[PDB]
Structure formats: structure tokens, C-alpha cells
């Protein structure tokens, strides 16, 4: 019954992907942002200028207050609220209903986005990072523990405003081509992985592979960009600037604030390089790579000056808190979060990103020595 979940995600570019859910009794319908970078299920529960609707506890006969507060500070944005429980279901998901923890958001800061169509957040990562502490069982743990839904999910995030699929409980073989390559989940808190090699247009960055994972690398659908630690971001940008020196862009573009434009249909894709991330494999001394096209890290932005040009923002940004494989990296791949086997699988998506010459890829096997030395401590 996975066909029912195909195309159950929507979103706007740079504004995440959301799925429809219901909370309470009688059911209250809300759009919920799908976030593999956090572990709290939370929904707006008080008026807010950017909310079209909100969770009204006073109307749900199944609401149970927990007499406990909560706040979550993300990389950017934060909210606070009240903890409680209620019945939750996913209309275009498994045909079940679970009692789960819910944070009713009463105040927020730079969290809700003006005109985004979602009103809450579904953190799908592990208890270790739940707020206030790891005793607040996350939604997906509740789902698996109360139903027979198998302990895994897969995300097919599509670019161009955007759609996708979240298969809860398995893999839908019509959503990808080729082979699935698995990398171990290093530790169950974020979806942490180990990057063992980085190449740009086929040229190795020749860095201590510990630099790629300082102080961690994660798979995070709640983050738009590919976020790279200081030393890696500098090497990658320098490499990307040189490959595209044919044309000139403001330094505010390489800082991810200014947008570059071109005539409608003349974007010089061929001057921007492909980025290959090599990930630790399942077998000794074995890795595999995923190749990112520029159509992925040049995020198209809606120019409302003259809707006659193609404009983009550079979606690779600097980090001081580790590598983040954000939504633009996940886009065009089918990503399997195999919690049951502590591994994350990658395959070319059915909605893969098109270049009339190059293609995104997931290729292996590759031999890599001393992969364990690349994890940071
Ligand atoms: C568990 C939580 C406390 C936490 C704390 C730190 C933290 C993360 C999670 C990890 N995931 C972060 C992730 O969950 C958060 C979730 C967002 C607030 C969800 C709402 C906005 C979704 C649509 C616009 C995305 C813009 C974007 O890209 N935004 C807002 C990054 C900067 C971000 O922060 N997105 C990443 C990392 C580096 C490990 O840092």
C-alpha cells in the first residue's frame, strides 16, 4: 500500500517539504514540515501572522496536557511551547493512528515562514536530541512502537512549486533506478554519516578526511543548503569559482545572499562543476559516491523584479557545527532511512535532476583505506 504515499509531500523552494497530518478528536488538519534534522513533533497552537490555522487544544476531546514546557533552538529560528499528547494520523500515509507527544507552539522567532502553507514540524531523528531531554519519545518511535509499521522510511524530495514522497514503513521501487548504496548511521542521534572523500569535477580536494566530518556530518531534510565546515567551504568555493571564472558574480553571491541571473534559458550550467561525496560503505575498505549537479546547489529563486530571467542563489554555505547534507543534496536521490539496520541508502531518484549532458549518480564500489580515521572525535 505504498502507492498511497507517493506524491504526499509539497513545498516551496527554500521552504522545506511538508506532509498532511491530523491532530486531535475530531481530527484537525495541519501541514507539517518533514525534518530529519530534529526530533520534536511540534505544531503552532496560538495565533501568528504567518499561520493560516493552528492546533486548538480546547477542541480535542483526546488532548492531555503534560504540565511541562519545552523550547527548541535550531541552527536558525526557535520556538517554545507546552508539551502534551494527542492522537495523530497521516491521511496519505499508513492507515493508522497513534498517541504521540506534541509541543503546542505558543511563541516563535524566525521559525514560521511568511506564506509557506505549513503550520508545524515533524522531527524524524532520534530521541538523543529531543527537547527537553531524550525521555520525550519522538513521533516515529511512537508510531513503530504502537503499530506494525516497520522501522524505516524513505524520502524522495523533488525539485522543480516542488513535490515529493515520504514512504513510511518501506521502500517504493517505482521511485528510483539502479542500485541502492548504503552507508552506516554512525551514531543514533542525528542521522550521522561519515564522508570519506570529496571530489570536484573529478579532482580530489586532498584534505584530511577528518575535515569533512568536523564535528559531524548529517542527513537533514530541514536544512536547505549543503553546509560545509570552514576549511572545507573555503576549498570548495575556491574550486567552484575557478571552474566558473568565465563569468563574474558578486562576492555577496558566494555568501548566499545575492542572486545571480541570466537570460531565460541561457544559464551556463556547463561552467559549474559537479561535486562527488564519497560515503563509507557496508563492507571493509569499501565506499560509494553520490554526484551533485549544479542544478542542485544553484537554488532557483523567484525573481519578482522581471519574471523574464532565470535567477538562482548559491546553496552551499559555511558552517561551524559540521557538514549538513541538506535538502538540495537529497533532492534527486531516493534516500532510505533504514533505522532497523542503522544505515542510510541512496539511489538515483525517479525525479532525478536533468542536465542534457551530465547526470546525478550513485556509483560503487570504491576502495578506500582507513575510512574509520575520517570520523571526528
Ligand atoms: C535538534 C535541533 C535543536 C538542532 C540543533 C542544531 C542543528 C540541527 C538541529 C540540525 N538540523 C537543523 C534543522 O532541524 C532546522 C529545522 C528548521 C528550523 C525547520 C523550519 C524551516 C524549514 C524550511 C527552511 C529551512 C532553512 C534552513 O536551512 N534552516 C532554518 C536551517 C539553518 C535549520 O536550522 N533547520 C543541523 C545542525 C547543524 C546539526 O544544527
UniProtKB/Swiss-Prot annotation:
GO terms for molecular function: amyloid-beta binding; aspartic-type endopeptidase activity; beta-aspartyl-peptidase activity; endopeptidase activity; enzyme binding; peptidase activity; protein serine/threonine kinase binding. Glycans are attached at residues 95, 114, 285. The gene is BACE1. Inhibited by RTN3 and RTN4. This is Beta-secretase 1. The keyword Hydrolase applies. Expressed at high levels in the brain and pancreas. In the brain, expression is highest in the substantia nigra, locus coruleus and medulla oblongata. Responsible for the proteolytic processing of the amyloid precursor protein (APP). Cleaves at the N-terminus of the A-beta peptide sequence, between residues 671 and 672 of APP, leads to the generation and extracellular release of beta-cleaved soluble APP, and a corresponding cell-associated C-terminal fragment which is later released by gamma-secretase. Cleaves CHL1. Disulfide bonds join 158-351, 209-374, 261-311. The chain holds residues 59 to 446 of 501 of the full protein.
Amino acid at each position: 500500500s505504498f502507492v498511497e504515499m507517493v506524491d504526499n509531500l509539497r513545498g516551496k523552494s527554500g521552504q522545506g517539504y511538508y506532509v498532511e497530518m491530523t491532530v486531535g478528536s475530531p481530527p484537525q488538519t495541519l501541514n507539517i514540515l518533514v525534518d530529519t534534522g530534529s526530533s520534536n513533533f511540534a505544531v503552532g497552537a496560538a495565533p501568528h501572522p504567518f499561520l493560516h490555522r493552528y492546533y486548538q487544544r480546547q477542541l480535542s476531546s483526546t488532548y492531555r496536557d503534560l504540565r511541562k514546557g519545552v523550547y527548541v533552538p535550531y541552527t536558525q529560528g526557535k520556538w517554545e511551547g507546552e508539551l502534551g499528547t494527542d492522537l495523530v494520523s497521516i491521511p496519505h500515509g499508513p492507515n493508522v493512528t497513534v498517541r504521540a507527544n506534541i509541543a503546542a507552539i505558543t511563541e516563535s522567532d524566525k521559525f514560521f515562514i511568511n506564506g509557506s502553507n505549513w503550520e508545524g514540524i515533524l522531527g524524524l531523528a532520534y530521541a538523543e536530541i529531543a527537547r527537553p531531554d531524550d525521555s520525550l519519545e519522538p513521533f516515529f518511535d511512537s508510531l513503530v512502537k504502537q503499530t506494525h509499521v516497520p522501522n524505516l522510511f524513505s524520502l524522495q524530495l523533488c525539485g522543480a512549486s516542488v513535490g515529493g514522497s515520504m514512504i513510511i514503513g518501506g521502500i517504493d521501487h517505482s521511485l528510483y533506478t539502479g542500485s541502492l548504496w548504503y552507508t552506516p548511521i554512525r551514531r543514533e542521534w542525528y542521522y550521522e554519516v561519515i564522508i570519506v572523500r570529496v571530489e570536484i569535477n573529478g579532482q580530489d580536494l586532498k584534505m584530511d578526511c577528518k575535515e569533512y566530518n568536523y564535528d559531524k556530518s548529517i542527513v537533514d531534510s530541514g536544512t536547505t543548503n549543503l553546509r560545509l565546515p570552514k576549511k572545507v567551504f573555503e576549498a570548495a568555493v575556491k574550486s567552484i569559482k575557478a571552474a566558473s571564472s568565465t563569468e563574474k558574480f558578486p562576492d555577496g553571491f558566494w555568501l548566499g545572499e545575492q542572486l545571480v541571473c541570466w537570460q531565460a534559458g541561457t544559464t551556463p550550467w556547463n561552467i559549474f562543476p559537479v561535486i562527488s561525496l564519497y560515503l563509507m560503505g557496508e563492507v571493509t575498505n569499501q565506499s560509494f559516491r553520490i554526484t551533485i549537479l549544479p542544478q542542485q546547489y544553484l537554488r532557483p529563486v523567484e525573481d519578482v523584479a522581471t519574471s523574464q530571467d532565470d535567477c538562482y542563489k548559491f546553496a552551499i554555505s559555511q558552517s561551524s557545527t559540521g557538514t549538513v547534507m541538506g535538502a538540495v543534496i537529497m533532492e534527486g536521490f531516493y534516500v532510505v532511512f533504514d533505522r532497523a539496520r542503522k544505515r542510510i541508502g541512496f539511489a538515483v531518484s525517479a525525479c532525478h535532476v536533468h542536465d542534457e549532458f551530465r547526470t546525478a549518480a550513485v556509483e560503487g564500489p570504491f576502495v578506500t583505506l582507513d575510512m574509520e580515521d575520517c570520523g571526528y572525535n
